[PDB]
Write a protein that binds this DNA or RNA. Structure first.
Ligand code: SF4
Ligand SMILES: [Mg+2]
Length: 752
DNA sequence: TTTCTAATGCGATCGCATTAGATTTTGTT
């Protein structure tokens, strides 16, 4: 009645009776269109209202897609949000049984690093560590985000190296010195326990929290107080747990305590997901238990969705040959055969020319993409594709309109940042030449032996002969070019105007440096004609992050913009996307270009060779994640064999989550699919061989493969130091509503 | 003026000097 016909296998998902129910929805099978097809059957045929619908996904986009596919149906015939927004609401209502304060602020990944580095550099003690601060606060932030993901709380972690150190110093076969290092990493978790515990005593003293503590608190309000769960169960009568294969441990005992731990059988609960696209489990660190954790005391049912819609055959002969014999539920089926083209070339740039030529002979002769494992690898491929004659799509503080705004702001606060003086003296406004830069250094020296003398400097007061106090004192014009002396007086008169504004608020500097600079008039003149009036998106994204910050503009806002270049890779601004980047996007032409060794399989620090990894005795996934025995170990050559076999079991498990990146990057196909992998890398004396996946797939397609069958050491350079010149003649010669607007603007300027 | 890991391949199970790469990345009010 107004839509397409429902499939006969999808009807069991739709017309299932109320109760818990698990669906194994495979790849490309359109799971959302049969999540919304159960909301409609549970509204028009009774059993619920529109207001009693709850859906929970991870990403904020794939909740908005499900938000509309319910309301489009229910208007043709109403509460969808993420997991981490359902935690912040579950602590604004019930968040006083467990004593947290309401209206608690949430720290950014940068403003958390500001606070974590300040409790490491204020620790009274010894620490016995060969590391530096800013490298023992990358272990504090990595255990205390992994202790609050398995719900551990710092007391199960003390004295876990005992009954392992007793195994090496006893049992007389020295202790081989590979086994002391493994013993020295585990007396280092215990050593840093008072750092990841005086950090929580300060985040509770200022009432500010994180994302790994939202779900850690909301899952300790779940299983502890039954009353909070009962109110939620009454409010929502149908609950939709989409993407359940990526649900962590802390998110698992917060849903299985609220929504049906065997409690209610009138609630329509449905949870979808396949075990074989579990790519994200190295971050969340996570379904087989479903039907054992959401029971009636009978176990829960199980159904399947194996018809694949946006995927041709022969990408289901390759994807089913990769996934089977290692992992596999049951194989999925199609409903013309899309082609496969495999290749192997003796150079990266040759293999960047093979994948470009098949992508250029389908554009000048469709929806195309490139799926790469490494973020860095993108750039070269992009340039190559662009160069043939194809248009190509691919940090905020590296944008050249904000970078200039970051650079001339710093030169106002401290005149010892010389690396932001050569951003300005060599920039497009006031282009200096190499003779005037070197004439300013020689003035900057004119304005300026034993252990005590050597340590006298490296102070916060010592004078270092910097350039920026030779612009405010340039001398006489016999040292400079005659056109370059008018610019030193101009930039010295401009800075003294701006340096008197450090008493003003932090935002009104940034709005006055923006006016005095030629910004937001030269940023709009570098955009094409058909783009519109749009020039200042991410130059106005910056100027709301400076006001949401406030602040002192010298220590604050300049040592905040330096952590945020390190910690979160610039900031967030306003196809050659990576393989994690597209998980729900299907194109026509999909190329997976680099399948060499040490690249696509990407080989790795286990729990026994670094501090931060949590020992598998103590995590909530333990028997996967094989925990070692150490009971029959009555020797010391056994202990170097009962552990080295355990490391190879934790390292083969690393490889089984790389086939899942084949099975999730092959089934995004819908058409022809490209596969390649090079033979010489870029900087290797010995060439990198193709990975197992590519030599394995050449044994699948051989039962069409293109002709596969001392490195590249060339130099890349640059030289330092037109319609603009042509368009300047038109304005020189003369000197949509553009006539009356100028008459409006010249009124206010000419009216005192 | 410059760091650190887990490798590799000679020796006298192991020490012991020499050299390649540095991931991927959601989530509030
Ligand atoms: S030219 Fe290259 S090597 Fe020289 S300073 Fe610039 S980035 Fe560094
Ligand atoms: Mg020296």
């Amino acid at each position: 009645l107004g839509l397409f016909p429902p499939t006969d296998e999808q009807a069991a998902v739709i017309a299932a009776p109320p109760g818990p129910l698990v669906v194994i929805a495979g790849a490309g099978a359109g799971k959302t269109e049969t999540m919304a097809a159960r909301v409609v059957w549970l509204v028009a045929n009774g059993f619920a209202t529109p207001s009693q619908v709850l859906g929970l996904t991870f990403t904020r986009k794939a909740a908005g897609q499900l938000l509309r596919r319910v309301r489009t149906r229910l208007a043709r015939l109403a509460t969808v949000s993420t997991y981490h927004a359902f935690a912040g609401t579950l602590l604004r209502e019930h968040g006083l049984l467990l004593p947290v304060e309401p209206d608690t602020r949430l720290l950014s990944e940068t403003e958390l690093w500001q606070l974590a580095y300040d409790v490491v550099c204020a620790h009274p003690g010894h620490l016995d560590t060969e590391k530096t601060p800013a490298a023992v606060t990358a272990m504090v932030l990595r255990l205390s985000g992994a202790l609050a993901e398995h719900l551990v709380d710092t007391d199960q972690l003390r004295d876990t190296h005992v009954e392992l150190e007793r195994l090496v110093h006893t049992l007389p076969a020295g202790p081989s010195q590979w086994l002391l290092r493994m013993l020295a990493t585990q007396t280092e978790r215990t050593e840093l326990v008072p750092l990841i515990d005086a950090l929580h005593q300060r985040m509770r003293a200022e009432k500010v929290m994180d994302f790994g503590m939202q779900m850690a608190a909301a899952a300790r309000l779940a299983a502890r107080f039954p009353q909070v769960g009962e109110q939620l169960r009454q409010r929502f009568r149908v609950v939709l747990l989409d993407e359940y294969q990526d649900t962590g441990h802390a998110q698992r005992i917060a849903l299985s305590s609220l929504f049906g731990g065997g409690a209610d059988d009138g609630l329509a609960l449905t949870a979808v997901g396949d075990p074989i696209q579990s790519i994200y489990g190295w971050r969340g660190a996570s379904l087989p238990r479903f039907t054992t954790d959401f029971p009636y005391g009978t176990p829960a049912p199980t159904l399947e969705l194996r018809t694949s819609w946006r995927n041709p055959p022969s990408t289901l002969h390759v994807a089913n040959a990769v996934s089977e014999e290692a992992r596999r539920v049951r194989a999925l089926r199609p409903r013309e055969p899309g082609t496969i083209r495999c290749a192997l070339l003796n150079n990266v740039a040759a293999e960047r020319d093979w994948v470009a030529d098949h992508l250029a002979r389908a554009y000048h002769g469709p929806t195309a993409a490139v799926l790469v494992r490494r973020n860095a690898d993108a750039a070269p491929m992009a340039e190559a594709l662009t160069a043939r004659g194809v248009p190509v799509e691919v940090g905020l503080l590296a944008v050249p309109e904000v970078a200039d705004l970051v650079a001339m702001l710093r030169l106002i606060a401290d005149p010892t940042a010389g690396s932001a003086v050569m951003r300005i003296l060599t920039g497009p406004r006031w282009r200096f030449g190499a003779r005037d830069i070197a004439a300013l250094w020689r003035r900057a020296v004119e304005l300026d032996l034993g252990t005590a003398d050597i340590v006298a400097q490296a102070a916060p007061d010592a004078d270092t002969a910097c350039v920026a106090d030779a612009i405010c004192d340039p001398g006489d014009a016999e040292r400079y070019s005659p056109a370059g002396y008018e610019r030193i007086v101009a930039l010295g008169r401009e800075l003294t105007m701006l340096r008197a504004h450090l008493g003003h608020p932090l935002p009104e500097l940034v709005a006055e440096v923006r006016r005095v600079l030629g910004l937001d008039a030269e940023a709009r003149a570098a955009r094409p004609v058909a783009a519109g009036w749009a020039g200042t998106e991410n130059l106005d994204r910056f100027s709301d992050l400076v006001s949401d910050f406030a602040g002192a503009s010298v220590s604050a806002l300049l040592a905040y913009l330096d952590a945020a270049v390190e910690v979160e890779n610039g900031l967030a601004p306003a196809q050659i996307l990576t393989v994690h980047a597209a998980k729900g996007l299907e194109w026509q032409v999909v190329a997976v270009p680099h399948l060499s060794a040490r690249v696509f399989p990407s080989t790795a620090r286990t729990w026994l060779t670094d501090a931060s990894d949590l020992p598998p005795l103590l995590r909530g996934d333990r028997a996967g994640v094989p925990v070692l025995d150490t009971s029959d170990i009555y020797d010391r050559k056994i202990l170097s064999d009962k552990i080295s076999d355990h490391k190879k079991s934790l390292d083969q498990r690393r490889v089984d989550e790389e086939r899942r990146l084949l099975y999730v990057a092959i089934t995004r196909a819908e058409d022809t699919l490209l596969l390649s992998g090079h033979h010489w890398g870029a900087t290797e004396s010995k060439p990198r061989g193709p990975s197992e996946f590519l030599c394995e797939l050449k044994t699948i397609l051989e039962e069409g493969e293109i002709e596969h069958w001392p490195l590249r050491d060339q130099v890349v350079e640059a030289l330092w130091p037109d319609h603009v010149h042509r368009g300047a003649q038109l304005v020189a010669a003369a000197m949509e509503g553009w006539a009356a607007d100028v008459d409006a603007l010249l009124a206010e300027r000419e009216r005192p």
